[PDB]
Each structure stands twice: as C-alpha cells, then as structure tokens.
C-alpha cells in the first residue's frame, strides 16, 4: 500500500514538467515528504525516462542551516550573535558572498547565504563537528526505497582537513547527496531534530524517530530560515501568499567521473512548510538549465513555491502568514 498521494504526484509532475520546459533544462526531480511520518507523498522525474531522483549533487547552501544549528549547540554563537562577514583569505583562497556585508546576524547569514559567515562558524569548531551533524541528519546514509542507483551519496571519511576543506564543507561542497537524502535532511528539520527513515509504504502515526538534534535549536533555525523567502533573501521567488516557509536555494556544477567540473549547472531548493508547524519537506532539482538563468534562486525557487503552494491548498493547511 504506497504512501504516494496521486493528487500531489500529479501537481508535482505538472509543475516540474512546466519548469523544466520554461528553463530549457535537461531534467528535474522533486521529492515531497511528510515530516511527521517519513512517508514519500510525491516523487517525480521529468522527463519520466530520465531517472534523476537518485543522481548525486553537491548540496551547497542547503547545508548552511545545519552549520548554524551546530554553532549554537556548541556555544560558538548565541541567538542574537552578529558575525563579521568582511571577505578574507583561507590558505590564500578569497572567501566572499554574492553581496558584501560588513556584518550579519545569524538570520542574515541564512537570508544572504553568507559563505563568509558560515566559514567563520566552521573554523571556530573542530572539523569533526559538521561531519557529526550532517551524519545525524542522514548524509552518507542509504535511503532504501528500492530505486536504480539509490545508494548513500559521496560522504567524506576524512582523517586530515585543511582550513579551506573545513570551509567548503560548511558551504556544502566536497560531498554529494541524492534528492532523497536531502529531502530526509529537511524532514528531520521539519520534525525539529527527529530522524526517521523514508517510506514509500503507508505507516500509522505517530512514528517514533531518533532524536539527533535538540528541538529548541532546530526550531530557532527554522524561524531564521523564513528570511530566505522574504525580500532580500536568496529564495524570495519561492514565496507563497498566506504562508511562512523555511527554505534554502543553492547551485552546484556537474562533476564528471574524473572529478572534473563541466559547464552544466544543478539548481535546487529545499524547504519545509508551513514554517509555524511544518507538514512537508520538499526538494526540487533542475538539471542543466539552458534559458540564460543557472542559479537555484532564479531557476528552482519559483517551482518550489508553485509545488508547495499547490500541496498546502490540496491538503487544506491553514494559512499561517500575518
């Protein structure tokens, strides 16, 4: 007895197919998860013979919330901390943001997706800290739904860490995830730190999970993430009238089997909604967009908003904005 809700599957496929066409993209995937049960409510590939739900990509900015949660847990920062976000060098490598800010709050670090801010959190913690947190939220763990190429992503078992490697890991690079893995991360965010397996078969709630992160810290960062879908945030194009949403939008470049990059982009948005009491985790990935826009916020955020808004209406979720 499958967990997929065919209403949600049909609107996910419709919106994903339209976004793949609009962006003149090779393909796209979307995965929708119930943050209380781990049930997969929708899971779509576009086109339907391009089996991209299990393709791996560097998760980029979608890991930044986990970096803020870890820094708060370790007491590197407090809830109202302000970071110095002036660009600087790590081992000769210039660390910069899209836009230069001299300083950001922790909310600003997510709103502006500050590489400078998250690098300073990372280099204030042992290299083991983010390795442990990412693992707690399921990165490097198999998903077990029975799909071709499924497996466990590309996750470091690293003995030795340069400063720049510690920083790029906090940015979400030098590791790879599947859409299913990332959806499970965001389901663990939506539950406020309860890790549950994905299911393509129905379960009866409540589903006991593994406590992998304190509720207070995860909820703190979910509220900070709301800024990303407000003006001046990287994910404003994902905003849904009537709802608070907690998202991150990001971009990777495609890696060949030689570990060399080619000039094909992977645009993604991951999120939970409604942010007041999450119901759903959603991941949308657009592969090789070719209509002159390449980044997550431009390419994948609009379809995140179209799909999540359609889900919230279909499932009669009460609007939680204002």
């Amino acid at each position: 007895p499958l967990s997929i809700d065919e209403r949600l599957q049909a609107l996910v496929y419709r919106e994903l197919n339209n976004a793949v066409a609009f962006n003149k993209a090779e393909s796209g995937s979307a995965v929708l998860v119930d943050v209380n049960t781990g049930e997969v409510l929708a899971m779509a590939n576009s086109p339907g013979r391009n089996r991209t739900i299990t393709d791996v990509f560097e998760p980029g900015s979608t890991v930044k919330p986990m970096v803020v949660m870890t820094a708060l847990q370790r007491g590197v920062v407090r809830e109202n901390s302000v970071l110095n976000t002036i660009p600087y060098r790590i081992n000769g490598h210039e660390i910069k943001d899209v836009a230069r800010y001299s300083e950001l709050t922790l909310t600003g670090v997510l709103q502006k997706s500050s590489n400078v801010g998250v690098s300073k959190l990372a280099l204030a913690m042992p290299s083991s800290a983010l390795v442990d947190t990412y693992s707690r939220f399921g990165l490097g763990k198999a998903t077990n739904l029975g799909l071709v190429g499924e497996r466990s992503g590309l996750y470091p078992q690293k003995q030795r860490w340069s400063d720049i490697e510690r920083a790029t890991f906090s940015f979400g690079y030098g590791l790879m995830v599947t859409p299913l893995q990332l959806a499970r991360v965001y389901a663990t965010i939506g539950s406020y730190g309860i890790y549950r397996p994905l299911s393509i078969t129905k379960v009866d709630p409540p589903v006991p999970g593994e406590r992998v992160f304190p509720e207070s810290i995860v909820r703190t960062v979910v509220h900070m993430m709301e800024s990303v879908a407000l003006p001046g945030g990287g994910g404003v194009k994902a905003a849904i009238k009537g709802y608070r949403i907690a998202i991150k939008t990001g971009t990777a470049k495609k890696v060949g089997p030689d570990g060399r990059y080619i000039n094909k982009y992977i645009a993604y948005t991951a999120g939970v909604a409604p942010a007041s009491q999450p119901r759903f985790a959603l991941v949308v990935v657009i592969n090789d967009p070719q209509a002159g826009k390449y980044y997550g916020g431009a390419v994948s955020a609009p379809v995140f908003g179209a799909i999540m808004g359609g889900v919230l209406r279909t499932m009669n979720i009460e609007p939680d904005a204002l």
């Binding site: 210039e94 943001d97 997706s113 030098g174 990001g250 470049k253």
Partner: peptide, 14 residues
C-alpha cells in the same frame, strides 16, 4: 580550475 572533491566550485565565490 576547480575539481571534486579537493577544490570544489562554490556558488557566489570564485
């Protein structure tokens, strides 16, 4: 140039 995993391409930071 960039390479995976030792010198990744990073959004917003050349």
């Amino acid at each position: 140039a960039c390479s995976f995993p030792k010198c990744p391409w990073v959004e917003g930071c050349a």
